[PDB]
């Protein structure tokens, strides 16, 4: 987990302000479009049902 | 160990303190509300093998 989760936190911290910029800016640079859609994929990935805990294997695989 | 709400222990303590006429402090919480949570959460600790051995009088040696 230490190896596969290095960037996640700061990546999301930046993506959540870039998504706040995004509302007023259409016609976004493709460079930032990539980052926005990736942050969105990961944010959609981390949500979880209320009683479905994951073993370290499953979490590490999904984060891989 | 999970304390379902330390926020309500503080309120219960404020009540049981004001009812004893002890002088209050900020937000009418008793003077030592910090000491209340402090001396509780400072028990959550990892404890080394020598302490475990001495407390249990040599009955356990390898464990922390």
């Amino acid at each position: 987990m230490k190896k596969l989760s290095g960037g996640i936190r700061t990546a999301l911290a930046q993506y959540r302000e870039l998504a706040a910029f995004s509302q007023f800016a259409s016609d976004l640079d493709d460079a930032t479009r990539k980052q926005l859609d990736h942050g969105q994929k990961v944010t959609e990935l981390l949500k979880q049902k209320q009683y479905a805990p994951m073993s370290v294997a499953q979490q590490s695989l999904v984060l891989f | 160990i999970i304390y379902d709400d330390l926020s309500k222990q503080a309120v219960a303590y404020r009540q049981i303190s004001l009812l004893l006429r002890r002088p209050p402090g900020r937000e009418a919480f008793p003077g030592d509300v910090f000491y209340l949570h402090s001396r509780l959460l400072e028990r959550a600790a990892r404890v080394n093998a020598e302490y475990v051995e001495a407390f249990t009088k040599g009955e356990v040696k390898g464990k922390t």
């Binding site: 910029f21 007023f24 800016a25 640079d29 | 006429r21 900020r26 937000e27 009418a28």
Partner: protein, 284 residues
């Protein structure tokens, strides 16, 4: 006042700072694109002017109306204005300059006439009461030459019909990212080329069908192209002005948080003190 109202106001001022900080970046990117679209526009006019020069006042010449300084009995203006506020002083400096020159002209008893690009100027000159004869609005950030044909068609028709004697375009000039200047400049009759095409001596064109019919269309297309260039430069200046306006607004919001927070701390301390003193000095 009270801690809660001041904290709500602080939250709203931080939100305002976010909004302006975003508008600045959007305006900067649009400024780059709108001056690329400005750089792209030169070659057409740059070559059309050479052709017109050679035909008009080279070794040979023709006597088209648009080239001779007839008597000025009334003047017309083509006015470029933004379609979006928050540009700073861009539009009002230009309109004040125009009003001063139109004052000068009307003093001599010569009338003045106006055709408006963009809606800001339309509303302004409706309020002041200037005579507006044709307008196009809602071009926004996608100016296209097929839309400018209308008003310049009107002004040209009124020029060669004898009802105008001089025609100006007033617009902003994008000089540097930090500075832009409003300019009134003449485009009928045609201003004087710095260069001489005496070196074109050696050759002349093969006109099909004849040069007189071609010079007319060349001059019309050149006027339209200059009006288009003016529109695009005014658009780039609009973006560069909105950018600095939003930068200053972000800095002013930032310097206002630092006052609202002092007021907030003062109210927080006063409320703590009053509550705790009421309790203690009430007991016993």
């Amino acid at each position: 006042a009270g801690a809660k109202d001041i904290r709500s106001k602080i939250a709203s001022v931080q939100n305002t700072q976010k909004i302006t900080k975003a508008m600045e970046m959007v305006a900067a990117s649009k400024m780059r694109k709108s001056q690329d679209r400005m750089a792209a526009s030169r070659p057409y006019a740059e070559t059309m002017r050479k052709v017109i020069g050679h035909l008009a006042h080279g070794n040979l010449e023709y006597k088209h109306p648009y080239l001779e300084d007839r008597d000025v009995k009334r003047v017309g203006y083509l006015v470029v204005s933004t379609d979006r506020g928050l540009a700073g002083g861009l539009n009002i400096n230009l309109f004040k300059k125009l009003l001063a020159e139109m004052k000068t002209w009307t003093d001599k008893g010569v009338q003045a006439d106006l055709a408006m690009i963009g809606s800001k100027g339309v509303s302004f000159f409706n309020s002041v009461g200037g005579n507006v004869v044709a307008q196009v609005t809602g071009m926004g950030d996608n100016p296209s030459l097929s839309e400018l044909i209308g008003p310049v068609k009107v002004m040209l028709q009124a020029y060669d019909e004898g009802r105008l004697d001089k025609l100006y375009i007033v617009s902003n000039k994008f000089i540097n990212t930090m500075s832009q200047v409003p300019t009134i400049s003449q485009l009928l009759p045609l201003p004087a080329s710095d260069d001489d095409d005496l070196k074109h001596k050696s050759w002349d064109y093969l006109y099909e069908p004849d040069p007189k019919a071609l010079l007319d269309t060349l001059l019309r297309r050149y006027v339209e192209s200059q009006v288009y260039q003016g529109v695009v430069e005014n658009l780039a200046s609009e973006q560069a002005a909105r950018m600095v306006a939003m930068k200053a607004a972000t800095d002013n919001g930032g310097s206002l948080i630092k006052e609202l927070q002092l007021v907030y701390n003062k109210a927080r301390q006063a409320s703590i003190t009053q509550e705790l003193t009421e309790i203690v000095s009430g007991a016993a």
